[PDB]
Every structure is written in C-alpha cells, then in structure tokens.
Enzyme design. Structure first.
Site, PDB file in Angstrom:
ATOM      1  CD  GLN A  19     -16.481  -9.021  -3.907  1.00 20.27           C
ATOM      2  OE1 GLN A  19     -16.530  -8.647  -2.713  1.00 20.27           O
ATOM      3  NE2 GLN A  19     -16.322  -7.085  -4.330  1.00 20.27           N
ATOM      4  CB  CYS A  25     -16.110  -6.537  -0.189  1.00 25.18           C
ATOM      5  SG  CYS A  25     -14.850  -5.292  -1.242  1.00 25.18           S
ATOM      6  CG  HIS A 162     -11.997  -7.332  -0.164  1.00 24.85           C
ATOM      7  ND1 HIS A 162     -13.025  -7.894  -1.592  1.00 24.85           N
ATOM      8  CD2 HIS A 162     -11.881  -9.522   0.127  1.00 24.85           C
ATOM      9  CE1 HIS A 162     -13.274  -8.543  -1.309  1.00 24.85           C
ATOM     10  NE2 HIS A 162     -12.641  -9.581  -0.607  1.00 24.85           N
ATOM     11  CG  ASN A 182     -13.265 -12.888   0.330  1.00 21.95           C
ATOM     12  OD1 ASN A 182     -14.249 -12.139  -0.154  1.00 21.95           O
ATOM     13  ND2 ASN A 182     -11.964 -13.435  -0.277  1.00 21.95           N
TER      14      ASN A 182
HETATM   15  N1  LIG Z   1     -13.817  -0.897  -4.624  1.00 15.79           N
HETATM   16  C1  LIG Z   1     -13.468  -1.478  -3.740  1.00 15.79           C
HETATM   17  C2  LIG Z   1     -13.765  -2.288  -2.053  1.00 15.79           C
HETATM   18  N2  LIG Z   1     -12.492  -1.879  -1.895  1.00 15.79           N
HETATM   19  C3  LIG Z   1     -13.791  -0.994  -0.759  1.00 15.79           C
HETATM   20  O1  LIG Z   1     -14.767  -0.900  -1.398  1.00 15.79           O
HETATM   21  C4  LIG Z   1     -12.992   0.288   0.024  1.00 15.79           C
HETATM   22  N3  LIG Z   1     -13.256   1.497   0.380  1.00 15.79           N
HETATM   23  C5  LIG Z   1     -13.072   2.007  -0.253  1.00 15.79           C
HETATM   24  O2  LIG Z   1     -12.041   1.985  -1.593  1.00 15.79           O
HETATM   25  C6  LIG Z   1     -14.184   3.213  -0.307  1.00 15.79           C
HETATM   26  C7  LIG Z   1     -14.589   3.688   1.005  1.00 15.79           C
HETATM   27  C8  LIG Z   1     -15.502   4.352   1.427  1.00 15.79           C
HETATM   28  C9  LIG Z   1     -15.802   5.363  -0.154  1.00 15.79           C
HETATM   29 BR1  LIG Z   1     -17.203   6.786  -0.561  1.00 15.79          BR
HETATM   30  C10 LIG Z   1     -14.952   5.352  -1.297  1.00 15.79           C
HETATM   31  C11 LIG Z   1     -14.068   4.032  -1.774  1.00 15.79           C
HETATM   32  N4  LIG Z   1     -13.723   4.035  -2.911  1.00 15.79           N
HETATM   33  C12 LIG Z   1     -13.814  -0.700   1.187  1.00 15.79           C
HETATM   34  C13 LIG Z   1     -12.791  -0.153   2.769  1.00 15.79           C
HETATM   35  C14 LIG Z   1     -11.856  -0.590   2.620  1.00 15.79           C
HETATM   36  C15 LIG Z   1     -10.796   0.327   1.906  1.00 15.79           C
HETATM   37  C16 LIG Z   1     -11.765  -0.095   0.772  1.00 15.79           C
END
Ligand SMILES: N#CCNC(=O)C1(NC(=O)c2ccc(Br)cc2N)CCCCC1
Length: 215
Positions: A19, A25, A162, A182
């Site tokens: 990524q 991710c 993540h 991953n």
């Molecule tokens: N950067 C970064 C990586 N982590 C994310 O992408 C995650 N989700 C959010 O951080 C998030 C979700 C939904 C929305 Br809209 C905004 C967001 N920042 C993935 C699912 C689990 C929580 C971590």
C-alpha cells in the site's frame, strides 16, 4: 466446518501488494475479499483495483482510511469494480476515474460477522472464502513479525487501526491461528503474511469488524 483451510492452496489469493504511504489498507482488504469471490464464481483469478475504491468510495476517506462494508456497497451500487491493470494503484487520492470498460468483478451485497465472534468468522471463512477483517497492528511486535502464531498480550481489541484479509485458519504447534494477508509488501512478515492467534479472547480485535462480499 473443516479444522483448517487455506484458500491460497485453492487459488483464491492474488499476489501480496504494497500500500505504501497511503491509508488504503481498507481498499486492499476489500479487493482481496472480492478477488476470492471472483475466483469461486468464475474459476479465474485477477488482481482488482484498490485505487478504484480509494478514489470512488465517497463514503470513505481515501488515504485517510475507510470501512470495507462501504467499499462493498459502492461496488454493488456501481455495477462493478475495475481490474488493477485497468485502474492502476497510484498511492494517493484522486477524482473518481472509474471506467466501466475495465470492469472485472461485480458485487451483489455483503454480510457482516457478529461483532467479536470468532467461531462465526471461522464459519464464514469456511463457507465463503477470504473475509475482510480489521486489527490492532500498532505494536512493534506485530510489525516485526517473522514466524509462529502471533500473540501479544498488549494488543488492544478495541483499538482497530489496520484492515487486512483472513484467507484461512488452522493450527501450528497446537496454537490455533488465522492466516492473514497483509498489504505491506512481500518483504514484510512471512512473505507478506502473518499467522495470528485464534480463539485467544479475540486477539487484536480480529473478529470485531469482519465482512465479506457476495457475488
Ligand atoms: N488510515 C488508515 C487505516 N485504517 C483504516 O482505514 C480503518 N478505518 C478508519 O480509520 C476509518 C473508517 C471509516 C472512515 Br469514513 C474513515 C476512517 N478513517 C480500517 C478499519 C478499522 C479502523 C481503521
């Protein structure tokens, strides 16, 4: 359900991707779960486009993060997702440049695994294929992972950060595990994979935010 399964052996899993410096991710995870269902449905595996998801899922935050369920909703509403080759990864958020001509999969909806329920996740992995999941990957121990069934007592199940892909499950040296793909490249972990403890109080929050697409 079987005692163990590994969808890498059945040809459901594409190469490990990288990524880079973008919080995409969630898009790699969503794409891996779609890749799995494409194989199952058509017999033919193809890399699908995380960039399509990063740019066109208006419900998510591009490189600033997202939900996998939002991505599956998009693919369904959009009547498709493009292949990697048709909508290559560029590692930054852009205007939506989806091209229906490069469509390589569809989505008919999605399901969510009951929160924290590792048997349910096991059953979904067995019945469906690879299932999108989210974990705490903040610990240096996780990040330096090389071998064995990863368990760290400091992993926080309530701090998901993540998105990754469960491509199977099983056991090693009596330690129940999940097989996790991953998106940190093949140089990371075990050729891009990690075995993470299974049935150990939902270690790292593995079953807290799991879903899969329908095709
Ligand atoms: N950067 C970064 C990586 N982590 C994310 O992408 C995650 N989700 C959010 O951080 C998030 C979700 C939904 C929305 Br809209 C905004 C967001 N920042 C993935 C699912 C689990 C929580 C971590």
């Amino acid at each position: 359900a079987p005692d163990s399964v590994d969808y890498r052996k059945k040809g459901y899993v594409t190469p490990v991707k990288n990524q880079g410096q973008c919080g995409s991710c969630w898009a790699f995870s969503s794409v891996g779960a779609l890749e799995g269902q494409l194989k199952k449905k058509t017999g033919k595996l193809l890399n699908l486009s995380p960039q399509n998801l990063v740019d066109c899922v208006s419900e998510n935050d591009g490189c600033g993060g997202g939900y996998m369920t939002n991505a599956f909703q998009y693919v369904q509403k959009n009547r498709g997702i493009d292949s990697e080759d048709a909508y290559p990864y560029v590692g930054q958020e852009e205007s939506c440049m989806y091209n229906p001509t490069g469509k390589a999969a569809k989505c008919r909806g999605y399901r969510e695994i009951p929160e924290g329920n590792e048997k349910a996740l096991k059953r979904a992995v067995a019945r469906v294929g690879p299932v999108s999941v989210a974990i705490d990957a903040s610990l240096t121990s996780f990040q330096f992972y090389s071998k064995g069934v990863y368990y760290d007592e400091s992993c926080n199940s309530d701090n998901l950060n993540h998105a990754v892909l469960a491509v199977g499950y099983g056991i090693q040296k009596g330690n129940k595990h999940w097989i996790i793909k991953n998106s940190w490249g093949e140089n990371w972990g075990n050729k891009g994979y990690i075995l993470m403890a299974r049935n150990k109080n939902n270690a790292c929050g593995i079953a807290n935010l799991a879903s899969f697409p329908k095709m």
